[model samples]
Target: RSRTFDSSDEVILKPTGNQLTVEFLEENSFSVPILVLKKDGLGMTLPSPSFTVRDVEHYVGSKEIDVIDVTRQADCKMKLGDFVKYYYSGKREKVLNVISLEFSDTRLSNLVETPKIVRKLSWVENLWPEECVFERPNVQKYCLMSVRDSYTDFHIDFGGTSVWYHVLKGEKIFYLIRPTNANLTLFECWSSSSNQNEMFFGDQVDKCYKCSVKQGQTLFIPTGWIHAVLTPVDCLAFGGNFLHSLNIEMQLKAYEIEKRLSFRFPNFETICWYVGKHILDIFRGLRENRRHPASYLVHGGKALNLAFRAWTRKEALPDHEDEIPETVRTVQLIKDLAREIRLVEDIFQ
Candidate 1:
């Protein structure tokens, strides 16, 4: 199954802050990736553009990280220290790339804070606090290291989280695909194909645009955009993932697709419980104020309630029993959330 369209139909590049807004994002449904032309107005602080591959090796080099051999489509584990040695070793044997080195446990944590736009819109960032004592979603704060000609294949980010990438140095080329209804259906079909590695998903879709992210530029990709990357040169990039209120249905859809593919995060269901509790608080607070919650919040609250009911049903309870917060009365919260959503929908209607 194939269709026709121009490549330009894919991603819309907007000025960093001019077209980026809570309302604009909600209105567009965040179903595609957005390129903020330059990093100037994002209100983020990087310790310096000078933070180099050597510096990263100094701080987190001992940690074991995943290394992907792009040409072979194989994966192996290596220490950041060893990877760095390979990076600067000046030997060109294989394209050994280290893509998922997280920085939270190291001294580098102090060097980067995600853009204020990301923090402000993120559900996990804004709601989860330092002292919460719950199992925190630690998906934020990663340092990506890639050498010349390194490639990462097409896939969605884990748990359907939205993603942001800032090119700290060098350049990266992104091949992006929209997660449209028909495109997603094709993606699922292609993913299940036994010859998936031989097939390019971009060719299976209507349009796949190639965008080059150069140094000092930041990219914000919204929920469920299928994408792959290539390193045109040696690069060090900082990026992170976040779950947000703006696109609950698509997020849930992406999660379901992850399940169908037999890939999973151990904490996927666990995070939903935490989100449901937070949504209940939001609904109650907004109710007390005699003002309706935002459209996305109501929608997200409803989605969370559905998941809560699914997870807490007598048959499903044991699977999520440990994740149930002591402060939450799950069934009652679900009922209250459903009621709140009904009232809001009636008002909006």
Candidate 2:
């Protein structure tokens, strides 16, 4: 059983549908911060209300996972069993949230497949070479257990990646903010403020829309959209993060923010190095076929290459070069990538 939020006239509700595309944003100029998709939007079937919390506890086991104290706005580690005990306690003290319980490597992995859109656009999934011994970021499978009143503060997904969430059971509300220039400036100011927790960021912006995502629905949040989630009722959900080419400049902007905050991702530079080669291959593929690279890919490749050059210092090469594609010249690859992009841009111009 679930409930909806009390209506706020200031909040603009988004249209729900069963189809999503990278072009949707390009056509709209990416004006929306959140998208709602109805059942089968991804043509993938995952058990919704049929899945239960007990089933998660059984599959994921008694192992410890990350937990957040919503009331205190504090984060601490707790065992899954301990959180479950709090969830079903019938009465509660602190609102405990169990997020980031990624179970991709476990036996439970077989039960769920991430949405096709997620995999198709994902950098780590489509680009990271399979044979590379380097461990790539694979926290793509997550089980979210939230109790009533559980709220997460405003933040971007790691590495400024886009995300897709499906509510398996219960309902969640989102306070979403678009990543406009003014809003982002306010956000950076808020992030550095001493009284950040005491202040409500939603109030600082012109519009912080309230979006309610109910059971059996999926939500796709694009890169760098600042958001927070609240559990009006207890909830069980599945979701994951992905880096894609659609919004590369914004993604890099978010990554720069992460670097400045000193909240960088594991192997961020190395992943860029890997993605650089992948983008080169794509350009080569399109060129060989005598086709121009897509307008988006050119900009995306340019942004990735710029970051690659910034990170590819003589002093730091040894630390991450092993994970780079074993091509003749890391320098040559950079130059060739630059030239290809120049050629494409020149054609467009």
Candidate 3:
């Protein structure tokens, strides 16, 4: 019989549906901010990990040294999981090899054509967080089937355990948001008498932060946190929340990362978190600087993306280099998201 996976860390893993508040942070300083619910950011664009398994093979296949995969948190085998593992663990050789794989759309998108990863992991409620973005553990065979429709975004299964989505077949849009972002996300406890349209109505992709998950990438989504999937063709994926309940250890991990990194940087976690948050909060400051619709977001997006990147990396803040040539994409996404917001507010409210 398979046992549920638990971290080696000593976390007082208690279960509670309490919203993570300033109070929780003070008392359960041990608590972590988990994107455990599938629909927390019901309408935000997904962030892309862009890691493919083939890239993993090309990078590590030649390396004489083998790094144990952290997915199962066990060293059952070194090269067992996805590209995130290789990217996080593997050094220059592995990176160079992966880079080579990334260049080939064929290589980068091999998993896109037949993703077995996403197909297997159904939304098993209470067993996982919607935004944990983790891969399934052990040698479990999973299935990923790509839908024919381009706009097919799967809602959180009204009933089931939390599910994980590994981008095995094609490019998939993604997003992330903190639980406290109910204001920007406009979350509310709708009573039976309430007008449903007043809350969470719009292009779900247009909410929060967005990115794309490429082949070989894995996204762990906890229950209730929203994940919208758009597939190019029918793809394949793998996953399963073997745990009966999706009680992801979000807080413990945050405490650990916060504990270690905060020691060196001192309040770095809180600082970076709040900073990224503030930037996310101002998701529509684009109209503040009026200009051609095309160029407006370009400039505004860079400001937001770099602000947070500068916070995360110690060395230098990388510019947003994307659709806007010689520019930053993260920044632009912010700019666009922000502009739409400003317009919506001025026109509606």
RMSD to truth, every model: 3.2, 3.6, 19.7
Ranking by lDDT: 1, 2, 3
lDDT, each prediction: 0.78, 0.76, 0.33
Q: Pairing residues by index, what is the TM-score of model 3? A: 0.27
Ranking of models by TM-score: 1, 2, 3
lDDT of 1 by residue, 237-294 (tens): 9998888878887888788787778623446665666677777777778878888787
lDDT per residue (tens digit) for residues 1-349 in model 3: 1112223122222223233222343343322213222323222122233534444455335333233222222222232244335434434122111101111133323332211222222212212223422321221223332332333222222221233444445555543332333422332232122654334322332334343456645454443343334444434344432211112223222223323322121222222232233333344343455522333223333443444454334354332121122222445444554555455446464
Which ranges of candidate 2 are over 4 A from the true structure? 1-18, 22-31, 313-328, 347-349
Off by over 4 Å in 3: 1-142, 152-154, 157-160, 175-178, 181-207, 242-349
- Measured with C-alpha atoms, the lDDT of residue 264 in candidate 3 is 22
- In angstroms, give how far residue 70 of model 2 lies from its true place: 1.6
Q: Model 2 shows how many backbone clashes? A: 0
Superior by lDDT: candidate 1 or candidate 2: 1
What TM-scores do the predictions have? 0.89, 0.88, 0.27
Which ten-residue region of model 3 has the weakest summed lDDT? 95-104
Residue 115, model 2: Cα distance from true site in angstroms: 1.0
Better of 2 and 3 by lDDT: 2
Q: Which candidate's lDDT is highest?
A: 1
lDDT of 3: 0.33
